Amino acid sequence: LDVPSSSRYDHRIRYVTYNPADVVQVDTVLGVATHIMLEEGEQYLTHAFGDSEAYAFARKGRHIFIKPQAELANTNLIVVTDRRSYKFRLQMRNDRNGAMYELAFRYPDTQARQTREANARAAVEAAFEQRVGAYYNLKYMMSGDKDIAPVNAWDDGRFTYFKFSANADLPSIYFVDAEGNESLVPRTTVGSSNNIIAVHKVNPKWMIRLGNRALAIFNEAYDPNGVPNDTGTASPAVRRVNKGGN
Amino acid sequence: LDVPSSSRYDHRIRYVTYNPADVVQVDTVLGVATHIMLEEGEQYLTHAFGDSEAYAFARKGRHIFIKPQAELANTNLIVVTDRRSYKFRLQMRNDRNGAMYELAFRYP
């Protein structure tokens, strides 16, 4: 039984942490209403009294009001919502002293849940950014319009990265096949300042274009074999597993 | 006859593990409502009291409330859903002490 703690200004406002394993003691004197609210954005679902007729129930939104309607109103109240279920113990007080005008909750369970998901996200991001056992190809050459050129080009065996300076526009990058024809290759823009374009393919030749200026980039150490993608992700330390089963 | 086991902060909240081959003894006192809490994703099909008049029944989704409405209300409540069927042995306790505000289930 959770006895709430009164505020230091007045005894009629009390506080208690929510606990899904313990009920809160509410002491109601005759002729007053105990104002109760729920945490912001909480969907009120249903409520149940021990005596529907001994107490009243007024609710609009998240604000809940009760009041004793009958002599000797000693029952409970179970207010169920979408995330939790408040269990009260209502004990009508005979001598009309030490009333409650407001019950307020401080919720540690929601924080304990919100923190775990951050831990899971951090774990997966750590797995992805744990990049280890990587080999880097730097044998890249270029010819053409050097005013749209990257300051660095390399590949890690799976993706090719073109690094552009801060004052440079990011151009379009095209895949060149053996006959010399260009074709679209998907890209993602990475880096702290979005200065790297990472294309999702390793190729012997690339075409860069910005307006009427073209730069050709050649991979001089092209490895046809590559590193096979056994895991279904971009790293060998994370696995894409079937969830649908089916 | 699995009697539910209370929490360590209060006895008004009990817990029980589900078992399709055993009933759950429910101890009801006068003037309290019992929040019986079902598993998520579970759809209610049908329930059948031992006496419809000995208890009040309310259900919203998977929440269940039962509350004695007559004296000597010793019956059984069998609620059947898609995944499983629950069994309760409702037994009214005359002393108005040691109620069970919430019954929470566990599943192996």
């Binding site: 007729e53 009958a70 000797l72 029952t75 | 004296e71």
Partner: peptide
């Protein structure tokens, strides 16, 4: 009808 008896009646009647 003592008040406690009326309280028990209210407990049994209400929903």
């Amino acid at each position: 009808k003592t008040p406690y008896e009326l309280a028990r009646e209210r407990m049994l009647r209400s929903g």
